Amino acid sequence: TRYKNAKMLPF
Amino acid sequence: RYKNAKMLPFAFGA
Amino acid sequence: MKVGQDKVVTIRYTLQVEGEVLDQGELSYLHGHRNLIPGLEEALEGREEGEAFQAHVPAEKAYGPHDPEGVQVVPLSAFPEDAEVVPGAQFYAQDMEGNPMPLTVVAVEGEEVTVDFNHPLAGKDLDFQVEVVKVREATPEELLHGHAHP
């Protein structure tokens, strides 16, 4: 659902 | 929310 | 020995979805601790070493339905500049608690990236050809951790 305004990180 | 998300055989994430 | 509670069960499998094969492999799980999808666990209950069978697991009993509110748009500003957004790639996001949230990008439309938080097999029924290669009783440490050692 809604996301923290934070950087995604790859697998 | 997505209850079965990380169960085997094919877990989504870690 | 028969597949039951607190037994470490290793099995070989191959998965059919829509008549197509999508993966085949081998894995061991601790039985009865919610480590396997419900339908497969119910199917394996009572089985004995060496048995083999087909098993149909509906979506409800395996990774659940597809949630439409599991699809939304996040700006590319949130992705690692080093990393490449490309349909099929998978990244992790973070919840308000900070617990992780896996995602699969479905499409990139310039600054806007469309992603699905659902499990890749949501709304998909599963077909398994499974043979039980071994059953053993779990070790204390595996029971303390809730998962099988390897």
Residue numbers in the entry:
A (entry chain C): 1 to 11
B (entry chain B): 2 to 15
C (entry chain A): 1 to 150
From the paper:
Peptidyl-prolyl isomerases (PPIases) catalyze intrinsically slow and often rate-limiting isomerization of prolyl-peptide bonds in unfolded or partially folded proteins, thereby speeding up the folding process and preventing misfolding. An example of such a protein is SlyD (Sensitive to Lysis D), which consists of an FKBP type PPIase domain and a chaperone domain, called IF (insert-in-flap) domain, that has been shown to exhibit chaperone activity. Each of these domains contains one binding site for unfolded proteins or peptides. Often, FKBPs are linked to an additional chaperone domain that can increase their PPIase activity by up to 200-fold.
In order to further explore the contribution of the aromatic residues W4 and F13 of the peptide substrate on the SlyD activity, we changed them individually to negatively charged glutamate (W4E, F13E) or positively charged lysine (W4K, F13K) residues. SlyDWT is less active on peptides with lysine residues in position 4 and 13, similar to the alanine mutants, while the activity towards glutamate variants is increased or unchanged. Similarly, the peptides with positively charged lysine residues at positions 4 (W4K) and 13 (F13K) also displayed only modest changes in their affinities compared to the psWT peptide. Although most of the protein–peptide complexes did not crystallize or yielded crystals of poor diffraction quality, we succeeded in structure determination for four complexes of SlyDWT with bound substrates: psWT, W4A, W4K, and M8A. In all structures, the peptide substrates are bound in the PPIase binding pocket with the proline residue in cis conformation, coordinated by the previously observed protein–peptide polar interactions, namely N35-L9, I37-L9, Y63-F11, H119-F11 and Y92-F13. On the other hand, the conformational flexibility of the residue i − 6 is also reflected in our crystal structures.While residue W4 of the original S2 peptide forms a polar interaction with the SlyD residue E60, orienting the N-terminus of the peptide outside of the binding pocket, mutant peptide residues A4 and K4 do not form this interaction and as a result, the peptide N-terminus bends towards the SlyD linker region. Taken together, while different side chains at position 4 assume distinct conformations in each substrate variant, these conformations proof to be unspecific when compared to the structure of other variants. This resembles encounter complexes where initial contacts are unspecific and contribute to the association reaction, but not to the dissociation step where they are replaced by specific contacts. When both binding sites are fully occupied, the two domains restrict access to the PPIase domain binding site in the tight conformation. Here, the release of the substrate from the FKBP binding site is likely hindered.
